[PDB]
């Protein structure tokens, strides 16, 4: 229910929510969430 109510916020921040997986200190795979900057994404998408 909370996710459905936050649909608009999640949609708005979708391009800026970076998600990766690492092998952490626990010896388990962990998901990491971070912020991707607009400038960083634009530069990444530059054709060169």
């Amino acid at each position: 229910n909370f996710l459905e109510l936050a649909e608009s916020i999640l949609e708005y921040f979708r391009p800026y929510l970076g998600r990766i997986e690492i092998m952490g200190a626990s010896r388990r795979i962990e998901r990491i969430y971070f912020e991707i900057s607009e400038t960083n994404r634009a530069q990444w998408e530059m054709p060169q």
Partner: protein, 48 residues
């Protein structure tokens, strides 16, 4: 041989995760599992 190299690169990228190396067959047990994995879980752009 050059055509074979190009085809091999294409097939490798489309049948295996570039980061963890697990094949698509495993991920596709879930609907569009490989696409979801390579776009939202192990995206090399996300690692950069």
């Amino acid at each position: 041989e050059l055509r074979d190299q190009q085809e091999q690169v294409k097939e490798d990228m489309e049948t295996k995760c570039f980061i963890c190396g697990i094949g698509s067959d495993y991920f596709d047990t879930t609907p569009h599992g490989f696409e979801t994995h390579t776009l939202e879980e192990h995206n090399l752009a996300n690692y950069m």
